[PDB]
Amino acid sequence: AVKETLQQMLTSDQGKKFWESALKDPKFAESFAKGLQAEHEKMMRALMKDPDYQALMIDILKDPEMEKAMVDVLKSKEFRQHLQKVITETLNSPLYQAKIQDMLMKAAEK
Amino acid sequence: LVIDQKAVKETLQQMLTSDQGKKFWESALKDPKFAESFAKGLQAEHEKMMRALMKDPDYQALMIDILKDPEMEKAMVDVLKSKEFRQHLQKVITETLNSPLYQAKIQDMLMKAAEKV
Amino acid sequence: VIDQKAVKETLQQMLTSDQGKKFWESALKDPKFAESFAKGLQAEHEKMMRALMKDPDYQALMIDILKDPEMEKAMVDVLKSKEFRQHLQKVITETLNSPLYQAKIQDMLMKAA
What we know:
The structure is a homotrimer.
Chain A: H1 2-7, H2 13-22, H3 26-47, H4 51-61, H5 64-74, H6 77-92, H7 94-109
Protein name (chain C): Spore germination protein
Domain Spore germination GerD central core (chain C): 1-113
């Protein structure tokens, strides 16, 4: 008897419309989430190693907010030493210094 | 209601907690509107999970691996070469060339170019 | 049996029980069930991750991650790439060929005369 009623209540588009309503109540949803939590966490860790999920995360990480956070680290005082180092190396190349010399000869020429 | 409290709990311990329950969820979640509703109800707890994972050093280490992907290296390279970042790069380059060391080297290089020219 | 209040309250008790947890443990071991769960929830998961990046509390965590020694090293290694070194030569050349700098160079020349 009871198997009949709950059959047309939690099984097809009925159940599909039933869960939609029950989960609008955040206490029901909290209890639903609680039973799933451990397994949801395990899956979210596991997906970090899957290439299709990595492609989603890579997309997310190119968001303007992450680009801004990256640019702030790059522009930080702590990171300035690293930028100076490659600038110093670039200027200290004898090949590059030859090009600077060419330009200084052209300025002295005029 | 004792006899019918038993029927309901036993029914739903079979319905939504065995083979039957599993099949329902597997189809419904392919419907992108029911998945929206479902994620919506669960959004609060999902946010808690993702925030907590970002504080977890094991999870952080996995995120670092993805940030080190060649695709993210390419993204960073583009940022470094952007017209935006160019102005900061110019400031660092300008402060270097303007330093007394480089001012001296350039003045020295320049007197050579003039001593030959 | 009021389809709502009553049963909802029963199923609510069952959803945080150990048998509820055992349902999710067993369901999510079936790869097809896991795939449908993951791909089904994907759109909203993305929205959650992008939205969270707009929160200063969460920005602090991503900043902590980017300042990790391993990330610092990766970022420095990118600075050292041929490609970045070539960009950097170009920016230096443009700054040296600048009217500002060309003018100091001519100020150095006359000053030596």
